[PDB]
């Protein structure tokens, strides 16, 4: 029996009457490129992706945020062409390239990258790490405004902070220094949250560092509603990713549901939901900046558990499921003598009635 | 058939599950390893724009690796 094809089966467009005139896959590389082309493309038959892929909704992700400025593409290409023109006109770059002795300023490259198109890649990293699906339940934005943060180790050196970096609790024990390059005049709001820090329930987050009504870049003048407390990643719990969020407060807003007293070390107070928090407070403003990092258990975490938090410290552990074994049977056939050890409970012996 | 998604292959060309879960059959593209000379030269002789497919088995991992559980509250 046969059934006609549902959709257009592959290799049907090509013709067979003419075969020698056709051009071939002269290269495994070209064949591979075409293979990934057809893997990218969808198919009517059952495929690997429709089983093992995140199944993102077909609708675009809602993001009412800062649009790009109107950059004159004409003058942009003009100045870029001029730049490459004097670049190719230079004299030493020939020997540099043909002797393989050139380099490039990493810091400057990073600077103009995060200026031009960094935000798109940072949004990519955010939607990868899972900030959006957990924070906003799918919605996204673009961190147009750059953002730098640092934890001064003593005072000589400092630990930087960027998307997806390790941070020690000993270094995060104090408040960080922050810069976001905005003296315009419009207000700002900043908040450091822990996504997976909450332990009693999922879909819950803590808040360690809140500042609101920040006129300009200066941060000290920004009032605080939720005072500072470093994170407390438990031993064995794994890793906790901490998020810096920054919104462009267009006009001053009050904080009553949000007003919290002196730290008082209350997780019920530190916990809330960013979803409804944004839905309520942030209807006037929009996201402008975003960063994050990753943290783990430490001796300072133990110290703040025992002394600061005024509570015992938890101790978790990863546990694998039990190894599967099928039902026993009274008379196994061609199974080695350790079949009984596979099921015995006690390693030691026992005697029934003696 | 051919392996895929937590399915190894023995020397006798038998397929075996590496993880515990549900099995599924699909059809995907077949990119050989360069050492497979006959496969490579077949790919070369193949005409441009055309691509082959082959069956694949894929076990869907049912359960997670494990779970984090509390050991002591001290």
């Amino acid at each position: 029996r046969r059934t006609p094809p549902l959709g257009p089966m592959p290799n049907s467009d090509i013709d067979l009457s003419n075969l020698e005139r056709l051009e071939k896959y002269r290269s495994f590389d070209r064949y591979r490129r075409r293979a990934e082309q057809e893997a990218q493309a969808p198919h009517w038959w059952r495929t690997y992706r429709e089983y093992f892929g995140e199944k993102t909704d077909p609708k675009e992700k809602i993001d009412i945020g800062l649009p790009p400025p109107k950059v004159s593409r004409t003058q942009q290409l003009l100045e870029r062409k001029q730049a490459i023109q004097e670049l190719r006109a230079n004299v030493e770059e020939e020997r540099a390239a043909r002797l393989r002795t050139a380099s490039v300023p990493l810091d400057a490259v990073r600077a103009e990258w995060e200026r031009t198109c960094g935000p798109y890649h940072k949004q990519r990293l955010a939607e990868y790490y899972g900030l959006y699906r957990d924070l906003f339940h799918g919605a996204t934005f673009v961190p147009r405004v750059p953002l730098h943060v640092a934890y001064a180790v003593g005072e000589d050196d400092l630990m930087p902070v960027y998307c997806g970096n390790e941070v020690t609790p000993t270094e995060a024990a104090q408040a960080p220094e922050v810069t976001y390059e905005a003296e315009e005049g419009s207000l700002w709001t900043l908040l450091l949250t822990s996504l997976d820090g909450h332990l009693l329930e999922p879909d819950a987050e803590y808040l360690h560092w809140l500042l609101t009504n920040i006129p300009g870049n200066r941060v000290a003048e920004g009032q605080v509603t939720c005072p500072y407390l470093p994170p407390f990643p438990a031993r064995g719990s794994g890793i906790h990713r901490l998020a810096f969020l920054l919104f462009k407060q267009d006009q001053p807003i009050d904080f009553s549901e949000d007003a919290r007293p002196s730290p008082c070390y209350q997780l019920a107070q530190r916990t809330f939901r960013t979803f409804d928090f944004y839905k309520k407070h942030q209807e006037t403003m929009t996201p402008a900046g975003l960063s994050f990092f990753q943290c783990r258990w430490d001796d300072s975490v133990t110290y703040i558990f025992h002394q600061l938090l005024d509570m015992r410290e938890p101790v978790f552990e990863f546990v694998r499921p039990p190894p599967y074994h099928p039902k026993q049977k009274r008379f196994p056939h061609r199974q080695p003598l350790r079949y009984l050890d596979r099921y015995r409970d006690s390693h030691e012996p026992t005697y029934g009635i003696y | 058939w051919h392996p895929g998604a937590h399915v190894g292959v023995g020397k006798n060309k038998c397929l075996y599950a590496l993880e515990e879960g549900i099995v599924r059959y699909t059809k995907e593209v077949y990119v050989p390893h360069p050492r497979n000379t006959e496969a490579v030269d077949l790919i070369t002789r193949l005409p441009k724009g055309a691509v082959l497919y082959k069956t694949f088995v894929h076990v869907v991992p049912a359960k997670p690796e494990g779970t984090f559980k509390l050991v002591a509250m001290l």
Binding site: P5 | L46, P47, L52, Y53, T55
Partner: peptide, 19 residues
């Protein structure tokens, strides 16, 4: 499989030269 519409999806001998 034959009965199903996906039959003949993998064949290549008619693509390559026969000899």
């Amino acid at each position: 499989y034959k009965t199903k519409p996906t039959h003949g999806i993998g064949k290549y001998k008619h693509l390559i030269k026969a000899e």
